[PDB]
Amino acid sequence: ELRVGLEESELWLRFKELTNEMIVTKNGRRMFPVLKVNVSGLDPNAMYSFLLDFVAADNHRWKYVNGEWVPGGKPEPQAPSCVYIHPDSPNFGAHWMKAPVSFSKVKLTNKLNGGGQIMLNSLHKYEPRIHIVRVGGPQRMITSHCFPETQFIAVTAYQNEEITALKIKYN
Ligand SMILES: COc1ccc(C)cc1NC(=O)CN
């Protein structure tokens, strides 16, 4: 059985208990914390690509009102985000299982942009998700995994200073 685990869940849970925020910019901003995944049970000799996307956790616009995040009352169906290909892709199962798979180079933006950067709906809440795609082989296969611990609201600047402080303390 293919096992997928979050590395540094301890730290993600500290962010999640405050409501996590990730900055989006026109040019794109890297994530802190970085999503790092522990993977076991791959065929060391099989070929895989690691994909990252962001699911809109709900259909609402969120606003920081008197020290607290609150959802709007006017939902709107959320279009799926684009997929980021881990730059080590494609690679042998052995490569992926030898150290945590680290999505350190994904950049989050608020503007339709050249290549790489993943565009998000601003002030929407997101749940990171990976797809492990077995490629090249006869039988194509996809395994998906969500990371609720890593949920965040996309922001153009931090709203909760407690988040600002944690981001600096642990970077
Ligand atoms: C600013 O709009 C967006 C940017 C990025 C993504 C993933 C979705 C949307 N909008 C929607 O999904 C609304 N149909």
- Number of residues in the chain: 171
Question: Are the C-beta atoms of residues 120 and 108 closer than 8 Å to each other?
Answer: yes
Question: Are the C-beta atoms of residues 104 and 32 closer than 8 Å to each other?
Answer: no
- The structure was resolved experimentally with X-ray
CATH topology of domain 1-171: Immunoglobulin-like (2.60.40)
Question: Are the C-beta atoms of residues 158 and 24 closer than 8 Å to each other?
Answer: no
To test the ligand 1 pocket, which listed residue (78, 108, 109) has its Cβ within 8 A of the most ligand atoms?
Answer: 78
Distance 140 CA to ligand 1 centre (A): 29
Nearest one of 26, 1, 3 to 101, comparing CA atoms:
3
Going by alpha carbons, the residue nearest to atom 4 of ligand 1 is: 121
Going by alpha carbons, the residue nearest to atom 2 of ligand 1 is: 121
Per domain, the residue ranges of the chain are 1-171
Question: Are the C-beta atoms of residues 64 and 157 closer than 8 Å to each other?
Answer: no
The SS3 call for residue 152 is strand
Distance CA 92, CA 73 (A): 47
